């Protein structure tokens, strides 16, 4: 199983980008996926999980009220909706999945997730001029 992010790049400050990142290989079923972020020089962090139903979703703090999670399952892959951004979210955006995980939505644990992706790097420019 195989994973891989679409949809970063540069955006303006308060703009809005969807990543997505579908998965690849022999697959089982679908299971639990997640997002995660860092920039340079910082710990790898938790952006957002969802359950291997689609029915349960998790967000960090930076999240809430601004990202949403989906996934379809057809498809087996996984999607953040960011609305409004700002510089402070700029980073490289990382999604993972958890193949063990038969209940509930992702730990925002990096060391629970087996399989990751490359990255997809978001960079938000300030409004000035």
């Known amino acids: 199983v195989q994973l891989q992010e679409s949809g970063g790049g540069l955006v303006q400050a308060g703009g809005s980008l969807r990543l997505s990142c579908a998965a690849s290989?022999?697959?089982?079923?679908?299971?639990?996926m997640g997002w995660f972020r860092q920039a340079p020089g910082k710990e790898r962090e938790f952006v957002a999980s969802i359950s291997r139903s689609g029915s349960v979703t998790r967000y960090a703090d930076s999240a809430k009220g601004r990202f949403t999670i989906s996934k379809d399952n057809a498809k087996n892959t996984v999607s953040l909706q960011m609305d409004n951004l700002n510089p402070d979210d700029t980073a490289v955006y990382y999604c993972?999945?958890?193949?063990?995980?038969?209940?509930?939505?992702?730990?925002?644990?990096?060391?629970?997730?087996?399989?990751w992706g490359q990255g997809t790097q978001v960079t938000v420019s300030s409004h000035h001029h």
């Open positions: 290989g022999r697959t089982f079923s679908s299971f639990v």
């Open positions: 993972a999945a958890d193949l063990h995980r038969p209940y509930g939505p992702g730990s925002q644990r990096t060391d629970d997730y087996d399989t």
